[PDB]
Write a protein that binds this ligand. Sequence first.
Ligand SMILES: Nc1ncnc2c1ncn2[C@@H]1O[C@H](COP(=O)(O)OP(=O)(O)O)[C@@H](O)[C@H]1O
Ligand SMILES: Nc1ncnc2c1ncn2[C@@H]1O[C@H](COP(=O)(O)OP(=O)(O)O)[C@@H](O)[C@H]1O
Ligand SMILES: Nc1ncnc2c1ncn2[C@@H]1O[C@H](COP(=O)(O)OP(=O)(O)O)[C@@H](O)[C@H]1O
Lengths: 239, 735
Amino acid sequence: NRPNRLIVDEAINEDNSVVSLSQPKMDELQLFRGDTVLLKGKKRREAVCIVLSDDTCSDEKIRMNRVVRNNLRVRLGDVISIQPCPDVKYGKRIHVLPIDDTVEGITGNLFEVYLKPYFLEAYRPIRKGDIFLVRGGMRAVEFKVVETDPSPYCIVAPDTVIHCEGEPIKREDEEESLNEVGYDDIGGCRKQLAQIKEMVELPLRHPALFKAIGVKPPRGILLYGPPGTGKTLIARAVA
Amino acid sequence: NRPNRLIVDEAINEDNSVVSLSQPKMDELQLFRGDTVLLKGKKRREAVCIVLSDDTCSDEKIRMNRVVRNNLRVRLGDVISIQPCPDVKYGKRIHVLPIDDTVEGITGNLFEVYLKPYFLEAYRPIRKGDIFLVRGGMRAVEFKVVETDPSPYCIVAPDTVIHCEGEPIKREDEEESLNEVGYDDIGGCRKQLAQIKEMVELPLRHPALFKAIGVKPPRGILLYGPPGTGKTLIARAVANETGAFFFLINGPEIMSKLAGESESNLRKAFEEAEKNAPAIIFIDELDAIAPKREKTHGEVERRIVSQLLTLMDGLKQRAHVIVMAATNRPNSIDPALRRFGRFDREVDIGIPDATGRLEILQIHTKNMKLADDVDLEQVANETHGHVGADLAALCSEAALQAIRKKMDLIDLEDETIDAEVMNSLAVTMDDFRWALSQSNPSALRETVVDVPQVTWEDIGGLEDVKRELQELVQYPVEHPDKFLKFGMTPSKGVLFYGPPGCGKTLLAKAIANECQANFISIKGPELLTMWFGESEANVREIFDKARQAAPCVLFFDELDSIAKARGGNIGDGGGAADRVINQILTEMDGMSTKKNVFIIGATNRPDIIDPAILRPGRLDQLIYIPLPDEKSRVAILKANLRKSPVAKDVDLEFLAKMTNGFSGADLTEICQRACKLAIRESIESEIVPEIRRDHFEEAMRFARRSVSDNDIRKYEMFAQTLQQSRGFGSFRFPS
Ligand SMILES: Nc1ncnc2c1ncn2[C@@H]1O[C@H](COP(=O)(O)OP(=O)(O)O)[C@@H](O)[C@H]1O
Ligand SMILES: Nc1ncnc2c1ncn2[C@@H]1O[C@H](COP(=O)(O)OP(=O)(O)O)[C@@H](O)[C@H]1O
Ligand SMILES: Nc1ncnc2c1ncn2[C@@H]1O[C@H](COP(=O)(O)OP(=O)(O)O)[C@@H](O)[C@H]1O
């Protein structure tokens, strides 16, 4: 059954480039703990991150964060093929710049405030064309890789230096804005959010499944609770 | 009279090619049991099937299924000529293909999934041009015969092989779609569906009969019941199975229009169906159409109500249309529509029982398969407060959860699903039990009507009372001649008084199962709710519900509950009269004594009962239930220990002896406590599967009698005062 494809799931860690996998799952690939793992999903984009350890997730699934889901253009309930890449790679020339939608109203240097306390003692394989978000400065800032040395063989290292011009770019509709709501913005609602997740996944992720079969999917989903609980937040996140 | 033509009827078997006939009917044709029978109806189509045996259908009729009715283009209430055909015929070349309306979204092979497990060891004479439906793959699939070897002399056999091209065809309006509703989609509704069947057959199947005669057929047929019972399902089935045009009028659809247009829609909805006579006009809901009870608001609402009223009584024959309506709340209809000529027939359909609910599960799961450990008998017991629509959602959720459990890690990234996996998808107990927890019943506050399954074998002792009850409610209903000849009226009701716990509720429940009648139970707090709420008019609906549900029995538990709430033995500044019992007394005077209804009153304090109910015409028969004796207590325990297998060393005859003031209910908690010990010790020793003697010995320490010792003499002194059979011992005459 080609045991190299796993189903995605929401991550429990607050870090950006972290992949959560179980101990029994990790030995099936015959791989080590501290390394770089390559992820191939759909839409001919690739993703490489750092794999971690888990012990309570499931029998066979992958837990990946929201920022790394945007690079692969994949969503919850989708299958992705994972393959290892045990090769040593460094970085020589890195050219990145943020988008004006998040750096509008910010002056001064853009290196010692967001680029230095982000990549220190991290060793993250930043791939070309990836979009990552940095948290700090009591606001949300996201960057993008425009051009660099030809990928692969690109990892941020202290030997290389970062340079930026200063002018932003214009984004398109191909990528999804990280400022929108998601599954990581819901707290406390664990038992009740799962019912909505399972009631909506089938009739949306597989529209053709219900079109052929005669099973009647639920139409109306009425929400309750005192004002301010987040009924609109859940409705927007599940969409 | 050419005894070869029989009337059609619905089949009771779930098989497709089965013809049901009685044993006396079968010898009239001089034919054998296992063979092929030829049926000739109308429209120059023929049909051949396999005849079976029956013993409870009728004197002379044929019972045939719905799929075989479509081939002959015949409906219920039609005559068909049957003739035998004793000739051996085989099959050589068969070419069949389904229609795209049912195989849209299915890929893979179409032979080993639906054609092989359909014709094996069957030997069905499939005729050319016939349409048959196959059930499987958790969906409905139907095929059709396009061309083959020239009929007759065509029977499917293992020697021949089946071939299919792959491209579908396009159907026409000549054949009726099997995906529509029918008479086989109704479960539990047996007594009430027959009234609609007989009320609609004559004015639709024979429109010319009523056109020549002056008999006035019923026009309006109002439907009742909580939402989800299937009022629309019945309305569509009776229109599809009678060949009449069905028109659906939604409640909010009229209201969604602006001023004037909503008025025009109702007017234009009548002559449109008039030209297509016969026709049936159905109204979805009437709460949002004519809520003229306390609204008294809006200028267009009254205009719409009056337009509907004028369109009701304005049907001066002309066509042969029958108008039907459905309302969930019987009390939410204006009396103007209830007048004669608009709505004179009322049908009240209630929540089905366990037997009725099991048929709903069988109906809604006929297209899907189930595992061997899957039984629908258990799920029909815990869903006591579920409506017929709740079971459809329950089975749909059970089917859906299977996909999320078995088709979660597969991730078949395909544009169209296959059939070799969908058929193999089975549903187990773990799928249904999860759906039971998530299901929320929508009908748990209304008064449910059910026939209890308790018989006289479950009541221990009290043999003297049973004969008195069997001789009071069963003779006037089954020997009316001896009551009409003497001219003396039967008794109205009976009163049960005595110490609590003797099982007065069981006596009322057992008499309902023997008489094959309904049973309505009212508890104590149900009466106090109206007394505290200052609304005594709610009992009128309770009385009216029992009337239409004939035959029925009425039960009133602890009628003295209101008297105890105002002082009890000491009473208060007033008398023994209140407002709840006043309405019951007023309604018992106006109720018809000729109906198959009965009222049973239960009480435990006869000293506080209002004497206004004992005077002749309301309640005269008083039955006293004394304390159980030693010989009667053995039977109580024997009947109680029937649900759970017990050992042989349990000497119940000994337990009967030391029990002196223990009532019938005083022994149930003893058995419950003894049974709890077995579970406790099994779970404790898990880290044996039979009840032991020592369990009953331990339960004797907590033997608490619910009745005291001072009130025992009060019942005896009351009974001896009421009877007083002293003085006149034995008198004789000199000659
Ligand atoms: N459970 C929650 N978790 C995170 N944020 C929340 C939650 N509930 C409410 N909020 C925040 O409160 C703001 C207002 O929410 P609101 O529209 O009032 O929710 P609702 O429509 O359910 O009352 C939103 O912008 C949302 O970010
Ligand atoms: N007694 C029943 N037997 C079979 N199916 C039923 C029954 N009652 C309801 N259903 C199913 O429930 C669905 C919804 O019915 P609904 O329109 O709510 O009935 P009503 O209009 O009487 O409330 C229908 O598609 C029908 O198939
Ligand atoms: N004579 C009897 N035979 C068998 N079981 C009895 C008898 N009397 C009472 N019970 C059991 O005791 C239980 C409680 O009855 P209860 O409601 O106290 O009766 P009542 O309302 O007449 O006092 C019932 O479930 C019934 O099974």
